[PDB]
Amino acid sequence: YGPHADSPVLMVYGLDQSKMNCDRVFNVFCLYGNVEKVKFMKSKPGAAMVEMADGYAVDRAITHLNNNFMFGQKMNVCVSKQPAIMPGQSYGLEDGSCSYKDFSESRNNRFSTPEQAAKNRIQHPSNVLHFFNAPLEVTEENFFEICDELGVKRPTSVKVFSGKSERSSSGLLEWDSKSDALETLGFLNHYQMKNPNGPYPYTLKLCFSTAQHAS
């Protein structure tokens, strides 16, 4: 009892399967809860199930993402009739990745304890993304370079926040439209940014901002 959704599994239609894979779905839905599994459906092109940690995550994802547009398609986000995603009958996507993926052990999940969960603000989709965990000396040009690599739209404005006694940078990335930002989110979240000072790339973390501008 508690959440409205009677399953931790949502169904999402309206995905662009020429662009989306399980990682890119996780890149969107991880803003709303822990993502345990994603499975693209054999029966239904452009649709995927997404198992969250619980129903409250489903309620948030539906509330914020239903009827949003991505790649000109209208997304439909609703509770699944299924209580869990089972692995059976998986297939390879065109990019060679599996139609099913388990993300339950991902270090990129953001709701793994209540106190971690609490640090996620309400995530109403907007045209500005907040970025965290970028390299200390990141520049707008760095982001342009990565967006070009990924084949996504460059942000129209980038703001890096001031920081001290901080081992990574954060800031704001703005696009002209909400769909521009959402489209980018799915491609750019968790991008592995170069670390000149240590072995591990910086995992770029994005979420939605309430800021009107990256100014």
From Swiss-Prot:
It comes from the Eukaryota. It is found in: Nucleus, Nucleoplasm; Cytoplasm. There is a cross-link at residue 194 (Glycyl lysine isopeptide (Lys-Gly) (interchain with G-Cter in SUMO2)). Signal peptide: none annotated. Residues 8-82, 90-178 form the RRM domain. Several isoelectric forms of the L protein are probably the results of post-translational modifications. The modification Phosphoserine is found at residues 7, 170. Transmembrane segments: none annotated. Identified in a IGF2BP1-dependent mRNP granule complex containing untranslated mRNAs. Interacts with HNRNPLL. Interacts with APEX1; the interaction is DNA-dependent. Component of a complex with SETD2. Interacts with ELAVL1. Part of a transcription inhibitory ribonucleoprotein complex composed at least of the circular RNA circZNF827, ZNF827 and HNRNPK. Interacts with CHD8 in an RNA-dependent manner. RRM domain 2 has moderate RNA-binding affinity. RRM domains 3 and 4 may facilitate RNA looping when binding to two appropriately separated binding sites within the same target pre-mRNA. Splicing factor binding to exonic or intronic sites and acting as either an activator or repressor of exon inclusion. Exhibits a binding preference for CA-rich elements. Component of the heterogeneous nuclear ribonucleoprotein (hnRNP) complexes and associated with most nascent transcripts. Associates, together with APEX1, to the negative calcium responsive element (nCaRE) B2 of the APEX2 promoter. This is Heterogeneous nuclear ribonucleoprotein L. It comes from Rattus norvegicus.
